[PDB]
């Protein structure tokens, strides 16, 4: 609707019903939408979570209306209802009218005067049961799509991106290294991996990799340093002969003016990542979920389509 639409402006028929995304919990959504923000229009109104459920009567029905208005009235703009725990988990289960009328608000806002269809739509809920609501109608939200825990294999892409993507027009790496070997077990066999090891495959493992550069050897043995007043073999008098406190009685000669040295390099203080640090990291696996949930969630996944 924005790359080819400008060359196919005739735009024959129905508008796009946006995003009916779902996936596994804790993953798979905002990391996409926040980047899609590069071309959405204005920086979209990512309001989300409980924020709709203001107070007993009217307030949510005011705010949602002004939300859609102030979103569209400048430019195309997404929203971020995400989980339907925000709105419309079921009919009933309400008090004073907080939810169910604002559900019917949603069904009436979604028509007629969006300004530009580049409003799209965006829902992103985990665990796409607990909706049971008419907004699944094709003219109200688009087709369902899953975000899921894959096989390990894409972890190599994930790792290399995380290492190399974040840049300051510098070609910097978050965790600089030269590859000591191929990923081997890391790409394809790294753990039981039923739950994903998430950023926790790199977080803390980073500090472990830093320890082999900052704590081992010198810092565990001496205070390393160079230039300035420095240590000297003063040899002025015996340390303890006349009394137990002769040592360091005299003060230093001068205060330092200034000194210059780079903060980091491939030579020093960098992360020096290795395959065996990732071996330690995967030994310290913490899978985000277990099959005792996925046996239920898999049902919740597959029953969401072809089934209701």
């Amino acid at each position: 609707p924005t790359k080819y639409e400008p060359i196919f402006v005739n735009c024959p028929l129905r508008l796009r019903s946006g995003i009916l995304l779902y996936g596994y919990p804790g993953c798979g959504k905002t990391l996409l939408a926040s980047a899609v923000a590069q071309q959405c229009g204005l920086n979209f109104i990512s309001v989300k979570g409980p924020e709709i459920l203001n107070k007993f009567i009217g307030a949510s029905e005011q705010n949602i209306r002004e939300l859609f208005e102030r979103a569209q009235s400048v430019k195309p703009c997404i929203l971020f209802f995400d989980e339907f725990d925000s709105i419309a988990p079921k009919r009933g289960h309400d008090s004073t009218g907080v939810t169910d009328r604002v559900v019917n608000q949603l069904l009436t806002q979604m028509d007629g005067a969006e300004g530009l269809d580049g409003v799209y739509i965006l829902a992103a809920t985990s665990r796409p049961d607990l909706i049971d609501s008419a907004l699944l109608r094709p003219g109200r939200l688009d087709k369902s799509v899953i975000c899921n825990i894959p096989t390990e294999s894409e972890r190599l892409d994930i790792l290399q991106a995380i290492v190399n993507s974040k840049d300051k027009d510098t070609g910097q790496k978050k965790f600089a290294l030269e590859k000591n070997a191929d990923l081997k077990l890391i790409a394809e066999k790294t753990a039981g991996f039923s739950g994903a090891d998430l950023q926790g495959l790199c977080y803390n493992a980073y500090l472990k990799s830093v320890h082999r550069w900052l704590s081992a050897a010198d810092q565990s043995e001496v205070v390393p340093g160079n230039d300035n007043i420095e240590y000297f073999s003063i040899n002025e008098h015996g340390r303890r002969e006349e009394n137990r406190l002769r040592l360091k009685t005299l003060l230093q000669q001068d205060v330092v003016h200034e000194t210059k040295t780079s903060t980091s390099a491939a030579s020093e203080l960098t992360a020096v990542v290795t395959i065996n640090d990732l071996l330690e990291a995967c030994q310290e696996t913490k899978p985000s979920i277990s099959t005792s949930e996925l046996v239920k969630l898999r049902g919740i996944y597959d029953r969401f389509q072809k089934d209701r």
Partner: protein, 237 residues
């Protein structure tokens, strides 16, 4: 001119009877025509429990039970055409022979439909190049299916035609060196060539089945449809 039923409930203390009295006044102020009413779950009158509970709110239903039924019994000018689906959420203090009867049901056609032909007839206004109408193969869909997704499938077919012409113009861009010094200025090129070809539609690729065979799950076919179909007779009458 219709009640917009979810909106316009004022929160303010004892105010909102004003909005019901105003909306029916403004309705009657046009002599001849109906008011649409959404699901009555827009009002969701629910006999005092597990919800609004009739206490801190009664102000809409306590008026609507009376005054528009007075008009309805004089039976002139203004008429109701509500679209209820979930009577289990409603008190049935309306929806009854004593006030607002004619609980009217149709169901969803099983498979024998002229609405497939009317589907074709409304994919029309955009061209199908074939001489044969080729509609009937859509009935390869498993029966009990005939919902609004008919036009979601026309949308998917149109998007497939769009994808075809998009990759065709991408091919033309790739070979644009045949008439420009570089494969450049696409955003100028399409406008300065403009050799018609103005998204003329390509329903010939029959891609409505190519969508339908995915079992496009925005259709509803579950036991919930059977629930509605049975309770419409068993309680909806």
């Amino acid at each position: 001119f219709s009640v917009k039923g979810p909106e316009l409930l004022n929160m303010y203390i004892g105010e909102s009877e004003a909005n019901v009295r105003r909306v029916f006044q403004k309705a009657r102020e046009a002599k001849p025509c109906v008011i649409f009413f959404d699901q009555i779950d827009s009002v969701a009158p629910k006999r005092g429990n597990q919800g609004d509970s009739g206490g801190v709110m009664d102000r809409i239903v306590s008026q609507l039970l009376a005054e528009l039924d007075g008009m309805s019994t004089d039976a002139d000018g203004v008429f109701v055409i509500g679209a209820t689906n979930r009577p289990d959420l409603l008190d049935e203090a309306l929806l009854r022979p004593g006030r607002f009867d004619k609980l009217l049901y149709l169901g969803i056609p099983d498979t024998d439909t002229k609405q497939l032909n009317i589907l074709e007839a409304l994919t029309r206004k955009f061209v199908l190049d074939n001489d044969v109408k080729l509609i009937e193969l859509a009935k390869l869909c498993p029966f009990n299916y005939t919902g609004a997704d008919f036009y979601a499938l026309c949308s998917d077919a149109m998007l497939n035609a769009m994808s075809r012409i998009a990759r065709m113009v991408e091919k033309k861009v790739s070979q644009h060196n045949e008439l420009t010094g570089e494969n450049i200025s696409t955003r100028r090129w399409f406008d300065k060539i403009a050799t018609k070809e103005d998204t003329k539609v390509v329903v010939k690729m029959e891609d409505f089945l190519k969508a339908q065979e995915q079992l496009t799950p925005s259709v509803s076919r579950a036991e919930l449809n059977h629930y509605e179909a049975v309770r419409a007779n068993f309680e909806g009458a």
